[PDB]
């Protein structure tokens, strides 16, 4: 269906000694393909998916200089925002940014986004039209004016609708063996007697890609939420994901309950019964 390319930055000041920790990660959909960590030995943008390793040294040089340049901007901004908020230099603080673009099934631009945060809260974000900014407070508003006087939004728009979409198409083509392949969830159900009268049924979805999935328990055809638990979707560690959902039921009544699995890799939804 649709695809996305996204970058996640995090900077964390370290008042005890030296400069901030800076970490960048790049994804295509739910696959990480590059990383930079200021604590790492390389000091390079590094590959994390086989299909990106084919890019030449030029690609690696540009991306490395640019992330490092960005890390330096974060260092500066950490200092400035400390000022905006009138905070002591003794405290560690955090800046985060996520940006990216979406394309549709035909590979056409769908939307772009770029929002950042300070200490885990919205700071400044690019509006959906990619022309103006949303400031969460008067600190961010100070940045907004400065950025509107310099038309920062235009460069972001030009990238999000242009450069970003083109590279996304390229990666999708080069890594099509994996990026354009779905792994449906491998499902099954387990049965844990809690007593002579009650049992917990757990519905498993394993080794699926991409991460988005819907797991639901039904009782006699109708959705149930009472006496259910639903863990957060988690990484298996091999590029795929896991999830489960469980329900407590009266013993002997297991056959009333069905688990329903929706996923892009499933042409028709799955329904499991014990």
């Amino acid at each position: 269906g649709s695809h996305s390319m996204r970058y996640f930055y995090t900077s964390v000041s370290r008042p005890g000694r030296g400069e901030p920790r800076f970490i960048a990660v790049g994804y295509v959909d739910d696959t990480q393909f590059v990383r930079f960590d200021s604590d790492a030995a390389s000091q390079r943008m590094e590959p994390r998916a086989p299909w990106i390793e084919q890019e030449g040294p030029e690609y690696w040089d540009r991306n490395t200089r640019n992330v490092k340049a960005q890390s330096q901007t974060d260092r500066v901004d950490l200092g400035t925002l400390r000022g905006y908020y009138n905070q002591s230099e003794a405290g560690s603080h955090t800046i985060q940014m996520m940006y990216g673009c979406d394309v549709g099934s035909d590979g056409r631009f769908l939307r772009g986004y770029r929002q950042d945060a300070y200490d885990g809260k919205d700071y400044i974000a690019l509006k959906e039209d990619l022309r103006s900014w949303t400031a969460a407070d008067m600190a961010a508003q100070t940045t907004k004016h400065k950025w509107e006087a310099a038309h920062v939004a235009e460069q972001w728009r030009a990238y999000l609708e242009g450069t970003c979409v083109e590279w996304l198409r390229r990666y999708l083509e080069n890594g099509k063996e994996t990026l354009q392949r779905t792994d449906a969830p491998k499902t099954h159900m387990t049965h844990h007697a809690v007593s002579d009268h009650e049992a917990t049924l757990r519905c498993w979805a394993l080794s699926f890609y991409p991460a988005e999935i819907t797991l639901t328990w039904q009782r006699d055809g109708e959705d149930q939420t009472q006496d259910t638990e639903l863990v957060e979707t988690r990484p298996a560690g091999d590029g795929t994901f896991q999830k489960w959902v469980a329900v407590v039921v009266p013993s002997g009544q297991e056959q009333r309950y069905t688990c329903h699995v929706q996923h892009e890799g499933l042409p028709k939804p799955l329904t499991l019964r014990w």
């Binding site: 991306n63 640019n66 901004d77 940006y99 400044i124 940045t143 310099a150 990238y159």
Partner: peptide, 9 residues
């Protein structure tokens, strides 16, 4: 590929 500029806040 990453975004190339980096105006300060």
């Amino acid at each position: 590929a990453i975004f190339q500029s980096s105006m300060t806040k």
